[PDB]
């Protein structure tokens, strides 16, 4: 599924991400835009052999099992394919674990390079929330 900007904001808000660990909703929408272009089915292979999955491009070396990343840890206890569903529940619950591990949203390279320090509130402007 490819989400609309406001559609995704509403879904993320209902799942408890607005101001989760101090990150306003606009940060999560900005990160999803540049990680996946709002597409739940997005996948990308990394140089080390791991793969990033879903709307928030969660990596298989640490967070999910895809059966082909040797030595990986599967800390969200989920198959990586569950992160590609049109239902974002699994991706949100795993993202909550990631953002609480110490480094905040700096774990998402696209957030650091393209959202951090910008007017992220613009990503929810005009939406009925």
User: Does residue 113 interact with Cl ion by CB under 5 A?
Assistant: yes
Under rule CB under 5 A, residue 75 binds Na ion: no
Residue (75 or 110) nearer to Na ion, CB: 75
State yes or no: is 7 an active-site residue.
Answer: no
Distance CA 2, CA 20 (A): 24
The active-site residue out of 18, 48, 52, 66 is: 52
Q: What are phi and psi of 17, to 5 degrees?
A: -90, -15
Give min distance, CB of 113 to Cl ion, in A: 4
Q: Which is nearer to Cl ion, 58 or 78 (CB)?
A: 58
Token pair, residue 120, equals 């992220």
In angstroms, rounded to a whole number, what is the distance separating the alpha carbons of residues 117 and 129?
23
Q: Is the dihedral angle over the CA atoms 47, 49, 55, 58 positive or is it negative?
A: negative
48 is in an annotated binding site: no
The residue among 53, 56, 34 whose CA lies nearest residue 43 is 53
Is residue 66 annotated as part of the catalytic site, yes or no? no
16 binds Na ion (CB under 5 A): no
Check residue 65 for interaction with Na ion (CB under 5 A).
Answer: yes
Tokens coding 52: 């990033």
Contact residues for Cl ion, defined by CB under 5 A: 24-26, 109-110, 113, 121
Known binding-site positions: 101
């Amino acid at each position: 599924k490819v989400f609309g900007r406001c559609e995704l904001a509403a879904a993320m808000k209902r799942h408890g991400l607005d101001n989760y660990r101090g990150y306003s909703l606009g940060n999560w929408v900005c990160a999803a835009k540049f990680e996946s272009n709002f597409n739940t089915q997005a996948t990308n292979r990394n140089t080390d052999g791991s793969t990033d999955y879903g709307i928030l491009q969660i990596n298989s070396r640490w967070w999910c099992n895809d059966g082909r990343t040797p030595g990986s840890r599967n800390l969200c206890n989920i198959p990586c394919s569950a992160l590609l569903s049109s239902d974002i529940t699994a991706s949100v619950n795993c993202a909550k674990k990631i953002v609480s591990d110490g480094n905040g949203m700096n774990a998402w390279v696209a957030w650091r390079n393209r959202c951090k320090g910008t007017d992220v509130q613009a990503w929810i402007r005009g939406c009925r929330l």
